[PDB]
From Swiss-Prot, chain A:
Entry superkingdom: Eukaryota
Protein name: Myosin-9
UniProt PTM: ISGylated. Ubiquitination.
Organism (species): Homo sapiens (Human)
Region (Actin-binding): 15-37
Annotated family: Belongs to the TRAFAC class myosin-kinesin ATPase superfamily. Myosin family.
Subunit and interaction comment: Myosin is a hexameric protein that consists of 2 heavy chain subunits (MHC), 2 alkali light chain subunits (MLC) and 2 regulatory light chain subunits (MLC-2). Interacts with RASIP1. Interacts with DDR1. Interacts with PDLIM2. Interacts with SVIL. Interacts with HTRA3. Interacts with Myo7a. Interacts with CFAP95. Interacts with LIMCH1; independently of the integration of MYH9 into the myosin complex. Interacts with RAB3A. Interacts with ZBED4. Interacts with S100A4; this interaction increases cell motility.
Localization per Swiss-Prot or TrEMBL: Cytoplasm, Cytoskeleton; Cytoplasm, Cell cortex; Cytoplasmic vesicle, Secretory vesicle, Cortical granule; Cell membrane
Domain comment as written in the entry: The rodlike tail sequence is highly repetitive, showing cycles of a 28-residue repeat pattern composed of 4 heptapeptides, characteristic for alpha-helical coiled coils.
Function comment: Cellular myosin that appears to play a role in cytokinesis, cell shape, and specialized functions such as secretion and capping. Required for cortical actin clearance prior to oocyte exocytosis. Promotes cell motility in conjunction with S100A4. During cell spreading, plays an important role in cytoskeleton reorganization, focal contact formation (in the margins but not the central part of spreading cells), and lamellipodial retraction; this function is mechanically antagonized by MYH10. (Microbial infection) Acts as a receptor for herpes simplex virus 1/HHV-1 envelope glycoprotein B.
Implicated disorder: Macrothrombocytopenia and granulocyte inclusions with or without nephritis or sensorineural hearing loss: An autosomal dominant disorder characterized by thrombocytopenia, giant platelets and Dohle body-like inclusions in peripheral blood leukocytes with variable ultrastructural appearance. Some affected individuals lack leukocyte inclusion bodies on classic staining of peripheral blood smears. Alport syndrome-like features of nephritis, hearing loss, and eye abnormalities are present in some patients.
């Protein structure tokens, strides 16, 4: 099984190396928000 | 700061480990100073012919 693996193991192993790299740094989070799903400018949905 | 194989990571050090590292650094500094002094003495003695 180890000689073949699966797609789920690749993402789990690849993502594990990425998360471990961010923990050893100072993350500068930038929160991105979308006003509406209709791609309209100026209009906002409170819900 | 030392790499664990891929990226860099700040490794931890204990009290005994820090003391041993300080002792090793002092020993290496003294050895380098003695070597430099010996080299300077040899150069001053070997400057004639």
């Amino acid at each position: 099984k180890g000689m073949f693996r699966t797609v789920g193991q690749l993402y789990k192993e690849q993502l594990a190396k990425l998360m471990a790299t961010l923990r050893n740094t100072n993350p500068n989070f930038v929160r991105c928000i979308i006003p509406n799903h209709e791609k309209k400018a100026g209009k906002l949905d409170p819900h | 700061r030392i790499k664990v194989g891929r990226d860099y990571v700040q490794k931890a050090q204990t009290k005994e480990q820090a003391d041993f590292a300080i002792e090793a650094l002092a020993k290496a500094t003294y050895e380098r100073m003695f070597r430099w002094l010996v080299l300077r003495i040899n150069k001053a003695l070997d400057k004639t012919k």
